[PDB]
Design a protein around this ligand. Structure first.
Ligand SMILES: Nc1ncnc2c1ncn2[C@@H]1O[C@H](COP(=O)(O)OP(=O)(O)O)[C@@H](O)[C@H]1O
Ligand SMILES: Nc1ncnc2c1ncn2[C@@H]1O[C@H](COP(=O)(O)OP(=O)(O)O)[C@@H](O)[C@H]1O
Ligand SMILES: CC[N+](CC)(CC)CC
Ligand SMILES: NCCC[C@H](N)C(=O)O
Ligand SMILES: [Cl-]
Ligand SMILES: [Cl-]
Ligand SMILES: [Cl-]
Ligand SMILES: [Cl-]
Ligand SMILES: [Cl-]
Ligand SMILES: [Cl-]
Ligand SMILES: [Cl-]
Ligand SMILES: [K+]
Ligand SMILES: [K+]
Ligand SMILES: [K+]
Ligand SMILES: [K+]
Ligand SMILES: [K+]
Ligand SMILES: [K+]
Ligand SMILES: [K+]
Ligand SMILES: [K+]
Ligand SMILES: [Mn+2]
Ligand SMILES: [Mn+2]
Ligand SMILES: [Mn+2]
Lengths: 1058, 379
């Protein structure tokens, strides 16, 4: 019943770097589990290669390991810490996969580690698709007609049997990874080869189509006494055929009769019982034929998931925390319900009095050639959530919270466009990321609810609500601001219309609608989340806005409050890193005595965990929403510097409206963010910046260009133009102009200014040269090649910039070093994404420190005045989503595409880099054949790389001019033909597995376009590849290290710091 | 603009919109937390003279259908919701909810802050209220009617919704596939249970049938003698509206059955009566239990079941005579949920094992009954 006694220490496996399909939700879950276990008295050990997580913060656990999530590495941790048990259900597919390998490898046996939460067998039963299917049949649940395949031949025969289109689902994958929908054979082979390959068990399940049926999911929790509860139900908005992760979804279910719901609830339970999950949570997914209620079991996830995080946020029932406790022996009835002030137990089914909506965040604009249609394989990079008393209020709020610039149903096509209905039709029929907008456009263009349904399969119950919102909008447009009487506006507000959407329709400024509401005293009220539809009281201040009567905010008059603004959904370049800082602001300030108020709506995060702060407002981070909160909270100060771009952009507006913004001023922010304003301060400071120019006209550039000197960084999506012709060519296709600093080292420096002094947090040398976005660059702390001398120049400049721009809290500075000269690239007057890594690396929690500075405690008062240089090296490496978008050229450049990062800790740089590289899922080997194909600039240094590879045992292949260069130096690689040259060529060789390493560098649009085949193959074929010579050298160095050799804990790391 | 308004005994007003019949409704206002099953709730006799507030905001999403009816009519005095959807959207739907309410002549209001309402009821306890839906709703009038309501405490409503004459029931449960099945032939049912109609849900009846019973529903007021005269294999005490305390007839009859060896099983009102007939005492809860997510533990098995609840009165554990042993309790508040006669084959459950709407978790209570039944037959 109560806590297990034969277990003292638990190893928790983390999820690794954030990638599409496996994101922040695992930092939230992992953190909750550390939390619960530590509270319960267990000794906690955990491994997670991603430094940007709260779960890896040293005070969160007993032995924290920021090391590559490899079995051999984990093997060393077990050996070293000797955990009695392992909890592998809080780290995504990464953890499940690892647990099972450890098991397979016999490591568990080896050290007598007991698997808790979920057994190995149970996990496999759910994870192996064939096993899963047999089990459903065993319990009389129905599944789609299908066939298992382990090879292409078997695969064809299944298709031959189910017909097109068919759904391909690999075993041992999640988030639609390695799968898809085949409309034809061609696509069938493509998807099929992909998943057999990606499937850890080389297995695919091929099913007949159920595209268009309704999609549902249930979150279940089961304890050892067999007690079983439904924590939340979710109805998808997008139908079957579009992955749940890439679908808009809402809770609770809406269109099922109680009769139908009971059957699904009963089937959900039966499924857990059958698979054998006896001590945790699981997600069961189903398909429902809207025509006759026919129920089909689609799958089950024996662990915490992105839906379970959403469900916790939605209901206030902390699934991961509960599950952790169950894993060690507790039963639901023994645990107390968190938010009901521990008054009721955890053994109950939550009841909510509101509607929860989740909308996915996409970033197709960063992936040009990518197929931007929605399918069974996730493509989204994040998600936002909204709570409203109604579905319309919920939806709209979510729409404005998505950070895509929408104010709600903003139009996509013009009323007067002759082709709009055709475009509308296409977007509906074949869902893209923009579908929702197009739906409203459809209603404005004349299609009926029925016509829309027909194209989309989205339930009419939703469609009608959106239609109703459109008609209301048409009314606003007609009546205008004059017709915005108190009754109507209130109506509008109740349906979730935003002041900004109303303002566009009425042709006035947002502020005008805002005043109007003030005049009429029309403000939202706040309701609290409480798991039980007000049946019991609550003491947690977990809130959402709504246009209702009674307000439950009940703010303190007692305390000095500090508000922290979140970043909204995660997207490329605005990830978990911003959230870590928000969380830290909150933890430090609360610890210090302030009443902390968090404002954010990312359901995946720790910032939105009601434990993180005193008060949580789960709202869109917009000017409207914020002012409403500030209105009633009257805080001492507001932090806008930690949430990324989102809150950064509200700064001035917030100050204009009288909000007490703390830390670096909105003006200051602007000075740094405005290029022009920035260029003058640099000048003022007498610093060095590359030559630049603002060109309007083409012919105005071409000249100015001559002025600046090529190459040039065309920045309206950046570009590096090499020549005059290049320039034109650009514009054509296509304004600032900056001289591109060719072959320079890029560096980032994070720091803190308190008006009195500057504290250097860290100097990070990037591996990839300037021109490769810093977010996509691997980097090292401390610098691995920069002279202390030039580093001193940077520290000075950082200092001068800090004081000049009046920074108060964090800042980030980016330089480019060329010919022993420091050039300023930019100043980011807020927390940068490098903050968590620098903090982990140096043991100083810079976001807590900088937050104290913001609230008024100086560096000196806090005792943080000296730069810390660690005794070991920390290397950061990133993970790119290219494998999710095959049509894209997996090439680095000036624009950021990575989703996450990992950290490598070593005695030497080679050692850190090797850990970083392994942690990043690199397929690099220590032997084999390497293919070298480099650009002219690279021709010189390539020789040295080639010998290092030779010295290591590799054989070499080279294309034409590279072979020439190598030849002349004495290296004679095996010559290989380019695709044009003849056969066999690179493609063939790569396809055949001839290589284990590929080094391919290029320069010039055209040159890049041709060589596309190499990277594309390399990625497709899983061969490790570098696209920069600097990276190649870094890879060469790591060949000398052994990532599995030694492991170190964060506590130990930090203890080595003198 | 079809106005409506609800007023509680305390003076609180909620102005919204009329969504059912024109008129007024008076009763005790209660809240129900069920996210699905509004139709079933509406048609449960137990809701007699009560004004039902549903906390789940969208009520009506799936429309209505005959199979979802718990009785021949809508018993709820009135309906209080936050939002009526534009459309009903479900393959089983036969009529939109507004139409349905109108058709049943029900006074209903939408667009009010149901949360505020639930919070008041929770905090200050149950209150009587009144809804007026019409041209220009009289707030003073509504308050007066609310205040003039007698109240459910001491009110016998069982006699009021009971059948007039006894009847036979032999119809089992619905299936997705076959819907409601045809009534069975008496010879196909091994057992014969006599059911006391105190405002019985059809689902109770159907679940008994599913377990081998053939029944004879009898009016609330049936005598023990006439009852025993039927030679039943068991006796069933249905659920039903109002205060159980006043039903002196039932109590007496019951006491009468307890002298014999016939298995007796009560559900809800049936649970309270058994308790009363055994020397226990009933109380009116602060707000009671209405929802479908209520945890009740089988203490003899140390196990939890999520159940459907719909009761405003309860049995005091503290006054339990010695012959009554406690079998289940609420995990939300510890109230008494089940009892069993130590000396007789008589037991009851406060919650609704038949659900409709709700979790199927407590179905098994029915099996114990059969068990008892068969045992009595062995004799
Ligand atoms: N027979 C099917 N027809 C159509 N779509 C399907 C079918 N089976 C699954 N899908 C779709 O594919 C998605 C992914 O399948 P799922 O089994 O959940 O794999 P994953 O484990 O990757 O999340 C579902 O969310 C659903 O929209
Ligand atoms: N003048 C330049 N020379 C070389 N590389 C540059 C130059 N300007 C920018 N870059 C490259 O472009 C990247 C992004 O430019 P930056 O001004 O920092 O844009 P962002 O605001 O997107 O962070 C840098 O990290 C760098 O690799
Ligand atoms: C989901 C993340 N991976 C599969 C589990 C691939 C990036 C980690 C190895
Ligand atoms: N730090 C970026 C990842 C490097 C990738 N292997 C490439 O060099 O293209
Ligand atoms: Cl592994
Ligand atoms: Cl995966
Ligand atoms: Cl079908
Ligand atoms: Cl109007
Ligand atoms: Cl940043
Ligand atoms: Cl693609
Ligand atoms: Cl109201
Ligand atoms: K053990
Ligand atoms: K699965
Ligand atoms: K099947
Ligand atoms: K879907
Ligand atoms: K799911
Ligand atoms: K770089
Ligand atoms: K920037
Ligand atoms: K109202
Ligand atoms: Mn899955
Ligand atoms: Mn899935
Ligand atoms: Mn930058």
């Amino acid at each position: 019943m109560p806590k297990r006694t034969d277990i003292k220490s638990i190893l928790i496996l983390g999820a690794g770097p954030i990638v599409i399909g496996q994101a922040c939700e695992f930092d939230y879950s992992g953190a909750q589990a550390c939390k619960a276990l530590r509270e319960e008295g267990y000794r906690v050990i955990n491994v997670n290669s991603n430094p940007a997580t709260i779960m890896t913060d040293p005070e969160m656990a007993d032995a924290t390991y920021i090391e590559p999530i490899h079995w051999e590495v984990v093997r060393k941790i077990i050996e070293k810490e000797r955990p009695d048990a392992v909890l592998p259900t809080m780290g995504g597919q990464t953890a499940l996969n690892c647990a099972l390998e450890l098991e397979r490898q016999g490591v568990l046996e080896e050290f007598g580690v007991t698997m808790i939460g979920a057994t190995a067998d149970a996990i496999d039963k759910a994870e192996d698709r064939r096993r899963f299917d047999v089990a459903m049949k065993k319990i009389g649940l129905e599944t789609a007609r299908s066939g298992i395949a382990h090879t292409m031949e078997e695969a064809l025969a299944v298709a031959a049997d189910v017909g097109f289109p068919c759904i391909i689902r690999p075993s041992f994958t999640m988030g639609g990874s390695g799968g898809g929908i085949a409309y034809n054979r061609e696509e069938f082979e493509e998807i099929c080869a992909r998943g057999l390959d990606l499937s850890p068990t080389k297995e695919l399940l091929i099913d007949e189509s159920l595209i268009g049926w309704k999609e549902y999911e249930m979150e279940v929790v089961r304890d050892k006494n067999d007690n079983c509860i439904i924590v939340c139900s979710i109805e998808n908005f997008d139908a079957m055929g579009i992955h749940t992760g890439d679908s808009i979804t809402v809770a609770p279910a809406q269109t099922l009769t109680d009769k139908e719901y009971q059957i699904m609830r009963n089937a959900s339970m039966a499924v857990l019982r059958e698979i054998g999950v006896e001590t945790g949570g699981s997600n069961v997914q189903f398909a429902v034929n809207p025509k006759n209620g026919r129920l089909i079991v689609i799958e089950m996830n024996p662990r915490v998931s992105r839906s379970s995080a959403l469900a916790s946020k939605a209901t206030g029932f902390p699934i991961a925390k509960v599950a952790a406790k169950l894993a060690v022996g507790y039963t639901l009835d023994e645990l107390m319900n968190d938010i009901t002030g521990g008054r009721t137990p955890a053994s109950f089914e939550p009841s909510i009095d509101y509607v929860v909506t989740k909308i996915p965040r996409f970033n197709f604009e960063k992936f040009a050639g990518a197929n931007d249609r929605l399918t069974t394989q996730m493509k989204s990079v994040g998600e936002v959530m909204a709570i409203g008393r109604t579905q319309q209020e919920s939806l709209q709020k979510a729409l404005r919270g998505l950070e895509v610039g929408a104010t709600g149903f903003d139009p996509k096509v013009s009323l007067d466009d002759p082709e709009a209905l055709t475009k509308i039709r296409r977007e509906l029929k074949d869902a893209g990321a923009d579908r929702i907008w197009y739906i409203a456009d459809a209603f404005r263009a004349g299609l009926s609810v029925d016509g829309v349904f027909n194209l989309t399969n989205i339930d009419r119950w939703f469609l009608v609500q959106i239609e109703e919102l459109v008609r209301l909008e048409e009314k606003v447009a007609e009546v205008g601001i004059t017709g915005l009487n108190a009754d109507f506006l209130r109506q509008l507000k109740r349906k979730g219309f935003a002041d900004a959407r109303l303002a566009k329709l009425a042709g006035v400024r947002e502020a005008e609608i805002r005043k109007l509401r003030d005049q009429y005293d029309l403000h939202p009220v706040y309701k609290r989340v409480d798991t039980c539809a007000a049946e019991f009281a609550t003491d947690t201040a977990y809130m959402y806005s709504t246009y209702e009567e009674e307000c439950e905010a009940n703010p303190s008059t007692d305390r000095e409050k500090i508000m922290v603004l979140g970043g909204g959904p995660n997207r490329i370049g605005q990830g978990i890193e911003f959230d870590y800082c928000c969380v830290h602001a909150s933890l430090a300030l609360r610890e210090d005595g302030y009443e902390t108020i968090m404002v954010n709506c990312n359901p995946e995060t720790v910032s939105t965990d009601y434990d993180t702060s005193d008060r949580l407002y789960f709202e869109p981070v917009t000017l409207e929403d914020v002012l409403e909160i500030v209105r009633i909270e009257k805080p001492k100060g507001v932090i806008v510097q930690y949430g990324g771009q989102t809150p950064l952009k509200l700064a001035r507006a917030l100050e204009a409206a009288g909000v007490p913004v703390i830390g670096t001023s909105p003006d200051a922010i602007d000075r740094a963010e405005d290029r022009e304003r920035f260029q003058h301060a640099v000048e003022r400071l007498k610093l060095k910046q590359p030559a630049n120019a603002t060109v309007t006209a083409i012919e105005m550039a071409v000249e100015k260009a001559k002025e600046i000197g090529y190459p040039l960084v065309v920045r309206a999506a950046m570009e590096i133009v090499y020549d005059e012709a290049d320039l034109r060519r650009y514009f054509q296709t296509a304004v600032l102009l900056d001289h591109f600093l060719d072959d320079a080292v890029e560096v980032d420096v994070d720091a803190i200014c308190d008006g009195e002094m500057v504290l250097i947090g860290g100097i990070m040398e990037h591996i990839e040269q300037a021109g490769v976005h810093s977010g996509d660059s691997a980097c090292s702390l401390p610098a691995y090649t920069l002279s202390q001398e030039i580093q001193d120049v940077m520290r000075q400049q950082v200092q001068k910039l800090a004081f000049e721009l009046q920074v108060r809290g964090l800042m980030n500075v980016q330089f480019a070093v060329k010919n022993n000269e420091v050039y300023l690239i930019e100043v980011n007057p807020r927390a940068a994404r490098t903050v968590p890594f620098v903090s982990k690396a140096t043991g100083v929690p810079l976001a807590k420190v900088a937050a104290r500075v913001m609230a008024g405690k100086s560096l000196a008062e806090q005792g943080v005045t000296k730069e810390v240089i660690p005794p070991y090296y920390s290397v950061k490496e990133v993970v790119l989503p290219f494998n999710k978008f095959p049509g894209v050229d997996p090439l680095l450049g000036p624009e950021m595409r990575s989703t996450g990062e990992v950290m490598g800790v070593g005695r030497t740089f080679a050692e850190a880099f090797a850990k970083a590289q392994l942690g990043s899922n690199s397929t690099m080997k220590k032997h084999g054949r390497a293919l070298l194909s480099v650009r002219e600039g690279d021709k010189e240094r390539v020789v040295d790389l080639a010998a290092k590879l030779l010295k290591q045992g590799f054989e070499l292949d080279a294309t034409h001019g590279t072979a020439i260069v190598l030849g002349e130096a004495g290296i004679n690689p095996r010559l290989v033909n380019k695709v044009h040259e003849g056969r066999p060529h690179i493609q063939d060789r790569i396809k055949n597995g001839e290589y284990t390493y590929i080094i391919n560098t290029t320069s010039g649009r055209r040159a890049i376009e041709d060589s596309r085949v190499i990277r594309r193959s390399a990625l497709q074929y899983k061969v490790h590849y570098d696209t920069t010579l600097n990276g190649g050298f870094a890879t060469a160095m790591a060949l000398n290290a052994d990532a599995t050799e030694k492991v170190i804990s964060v506590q130990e790391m930090h203890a080595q710091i003198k | 603009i079809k106005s409506a308004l609800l007023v509680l005994e305390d003076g609180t007003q909620f102005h919204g919109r009329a969504i059912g019949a024109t008129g007024s409704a008076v009763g005790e206002v209660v809240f129900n937390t069920s996210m699905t099953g509004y139709q079933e709730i509406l048609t449960d006799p137990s809701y007699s003279r009560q004004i039902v507030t549903l906390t789940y905001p969208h009520i009506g999403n799936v429309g209505t259908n005959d199979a979802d009816e718990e009785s021949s009519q809508v018993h709820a005095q009135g309906l209080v919701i936050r939002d009526l959807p534009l459309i009903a959207s479900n393959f089983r739907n036969t009529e939109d909810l507004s139409s349905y309410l109108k058709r049943h002549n029900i006074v209903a209001i939408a667009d009010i802050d149901t949360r505020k309402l639930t919070r008041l009821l929770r905090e200050k306890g149950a209150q009587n209220g009144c809804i007026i839906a019409g041209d220009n709703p009289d707030a003073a009038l509504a308050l007066e009617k609310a205040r003039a309501f007698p109240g459910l405490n001491g009110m016998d409503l069982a006699k009021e919704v009971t059948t007039a004459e006894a009847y036979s029931w032999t119809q089992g449960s619905w299936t997705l596939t076959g819907g409601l099945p045809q009534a069975k032939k008496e010879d196909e049912l091994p057992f014969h249970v006599v059911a006391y109609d105190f405002g019985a849900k059809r689902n109770i009846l159907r679940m008994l049938v599913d377990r081998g019973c053939r029944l004879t529903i009898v009016p609330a007021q049936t005598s023990a003698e006439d009852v025993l005269k039927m030679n039943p294999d068991g006796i069933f005490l249905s659920n039903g509206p109002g205060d159980p305390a006043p039903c002196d007839y039932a109590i007496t009859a019951i006491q009468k059955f307890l002298e014999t060896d016939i298995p007796v099983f009560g559900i809800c009102l049936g649970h309270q009566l058994l308790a009363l007939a055994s020397g226990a005492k009933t109380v009116k809860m602060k707000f009671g239990h209405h929802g479908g997510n209520h945890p009740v533990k089988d203490v003899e098995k140390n196990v939890v079941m999520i159940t459907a609840q719909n009761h405003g009165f309860a049995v005091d554990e503290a006054t339990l005579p010695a012959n009554l042993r406690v079998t289940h309790k609420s995990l939300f508040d510890g109230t008494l949920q089940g009892i069993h006669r130590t000396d007789k084959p008589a037991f009851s459950f406060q919650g609704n094992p038949e659900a409709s709407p709700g979790p199927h978790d407590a179905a098994p209570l029915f099996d114990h009954f059969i068990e008892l039944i068969e045992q009595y037959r062995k004799t």
